[PDB]
Design a protein around this ligand. Sequence first.
Ligand SMILES: COc1ccccc1CNc1cnc(C(=O)O)cc1C(=O)O
Ligand SMILES: [Mn+2]
Length: 236
Amino acid sequence: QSTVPRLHRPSLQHFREQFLVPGRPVILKGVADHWPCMQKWSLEYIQEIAGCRTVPVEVGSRYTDEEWSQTLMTVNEFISKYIVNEPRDVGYLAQHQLFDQIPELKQDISIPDYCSLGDGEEEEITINAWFGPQGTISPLHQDPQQNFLVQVMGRKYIRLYSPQESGALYPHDTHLLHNTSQVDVENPDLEKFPKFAKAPFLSCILSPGEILFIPVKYWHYVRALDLSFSVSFWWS
Ligand SMILES: COc1ccccc1CNc1cnc(C(=O)O)cc1C(=O)O
Ligand SMILES: [Mn+2]
């Protein structure tokens, strides 16, 4: 097979031994599925609690041959321009510490208990919101910390490549992009990147209530299948 395993509420020792230490991805069930965000966060709730706040928005075109420009707008404007009406471009309220900006929302989540297995402080855990329409796509990339990616709204297709396959992923030569792959995962140029086709991977569709553990430096690729809202915990 090649799917990420799903475990229900495993023990801290079981998670530590079989996944954190060796660096193996896993989906945790029955952990975040009773967080209040799982029943409260609708577009209506998000507009009520956050609608008038300014948020950074990444905007790019469906044509992949562009950069994402970074702008500012109110959550109300974001929802109106990029979620409800057919938009020319895709907009993504991505990698934002919304819960520091709006503590009222921090009541609706928690920090997974498994984070305490790390060697860092809880006051150093980065919490980011990923709120966007169907069709947002990350590059294939790796991050310098452990990650819990919690799906709240919608589904996301995720592809994972171990740091050991890095050679077949053709990272960019620039220093600023050495953590990012040059390959388009879902339509690769196998004439320019032939080693990509035989690089093994894990994949999953992450659904609401589920938590994907992305080991530090594990390459991950993310595409939103629906109107989606995710919360990531970056920790060490
Ligand atoms: C700011 O970055 C952008 C900008 C535009 C499009 C995609 C991305 C990155 N997309 C992710 C990266 N990393 C994670 C993770 O959990 O580490 C999650 C996502 C996710 O889109 O859900
Ligand atoms: Mn990432």
